[PDB]
Design a protein around this nucleic acid. Structure first.
Lengths: 100, 180, 46, 46
DNA sequence: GTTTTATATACATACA
DNA sequence: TGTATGTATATAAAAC
């Protein structure tokens, strides 16, 4: 259970980098690092589920889309994003995993 | 008449000659979908010619949405190259146009019930089920969708001249049942 | 680098118009981070 | 710029650390090592 | 059952 | 209580 996609996020990469250091730089038990990441996967999921309110709206040109193995990938170009403020992005990559 | 039906869609078949691993194609082709739980094929799309392709594991392929024989074959070739570039030993064999759809506007209302009764052998009209009259022509084996507004849909053709001839045959009947 | 990670509830298409109902996600847009409960995507393919 | 994001991020760090502590204690590593993980992670995250 | 295209009705959820 | 999307109905054709 729990997808590992959130490890690619800013907070996820940071965690990876921290752990990698404790392993290499130090002598801190690897494998435990994996245990930690398994915890991360679950936490981010419940937190994003129970601790969020924002509603986003993304409108733009669909440059590319794709589906395989319960994962949708989209690349939106020249888009305006609305938070609940209006932000503009030249290129946005979206990766979505099945909710079911 | 000076009214020539407009081609709206062409469906074609092509044999690539090799077997394909759909997942590999999906993972390496842009704008492709692969959901074996829905349809056992890879759905792939290109913008020019704006068409859609149903690619199969057998190497069999169907291309739709083209509006001309040239576009149909061109798109088909494009999908072919894309598959080849992915690493599959595909070939472009047996390209065949299987269906051509066309439509036109006569610009005058039509008395459907009347049309149906006079040509009962070919006509099917249940406005409550579907608002158009389903006219099955035997001459060029073409099926026409006749509407009270004077708009016509013609389908089931192997070549465009069939769409054309089917309309020339029906036109007199349309004038014959003009509602004005 | 302008990456959105999330879950999808529904994805639909009509002609070249796509719509997507996203949930529980995180995005980095122009060096800033947003977290959301829901997101709707309206994109036009060519 | 988003505040909910930083709050979510805070919840994630705090929540993960406390959970991970059991395993950390099992592996007989070090409470201050866990503290380092927390500080570095939060450091990288900026 | 998929995908594409013209055409036309009813009906069904939403939205301010 | 309109403007919006959606569902459905019906046609040809191939591939699975």
């Amino acid at each position: 259970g729990y997808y590992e996609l959130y490890r690619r996020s800013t907070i996820g990469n940071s965690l990876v980098d921290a752990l990698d250091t404790l392993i290499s730089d130090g002598r801190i038990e690897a494998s435990l690092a994996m245990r930690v990441l398994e915890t991360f996967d679950k936490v981010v999921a419940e937190t994003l589920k129970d601790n969020t309110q924002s509603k986003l709206t993304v409108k733009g040109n669909l440059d590319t889309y794709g589906f395989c193995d319960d994962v949708w990938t989209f690349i939106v170009k020249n888009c305006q994003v609305t938070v609940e403020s209006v932000i503009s992005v030249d290129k946005l990559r979206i990766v979505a995993c099945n909710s079911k | 008449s000076g009214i020539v039906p407009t081609l709206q869609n062409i469906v074609a078949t092509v044999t690539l000659g090799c077997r394909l691993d759909l997942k590999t194609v999906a993972l390496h082709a842009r704008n492709a979908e692969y959901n074996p739980k829905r349809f056992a094929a890879v759905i792939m799309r290109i913008r020019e010619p704006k068409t859609t392709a149903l690619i199969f594991a057998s190497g069999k392929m169907v291309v739709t949405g083209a509006k001309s024989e040239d576009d149909s074959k061109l798109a088909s070739r494009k999908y072919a190259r894309i598959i080849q570039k992915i690493g599959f030993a595909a070939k472009f064999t047996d390209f065949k146009i299987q269906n051509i759809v066309g439509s036109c506007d006569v610009k005058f209302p039509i008395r459907l019930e009347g049309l149906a009764f006079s040509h009962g052998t070919f006509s099917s009209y249940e406005p409550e089920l579907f608002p158009g009259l389903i006219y099955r022509m035997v001459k060029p084996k073409i099926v026409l969708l006749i509407f009270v507004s004077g708009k016509i849909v013609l389908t089931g053709a192997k070549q465009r001249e069939e769409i054309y001839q089917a309309f020339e045959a029906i036109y007199p009947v349309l004038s014959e049942f003009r509602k004005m | 680098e302008n990456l959105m990670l999330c879950l999808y509830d529904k994805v639909t298409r009509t002609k070249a118009r796509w719509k997507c109902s996203l949930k529980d996600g995180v995005v980095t847009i122009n060096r800033n981070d947003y977290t959301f409960q829901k997101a709707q995507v309206e994109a036009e393919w060519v | 710029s988003n505040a909910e994001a930083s709050r979510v991020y805070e919840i994630i760090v705090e929540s993960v650390v406390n959970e991970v502590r059991e395993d950390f204690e099992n592996a007989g590593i070090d409470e201050q090592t866990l503290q380092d993980l927390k500080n570095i992670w939060q450091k990288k995250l900026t």
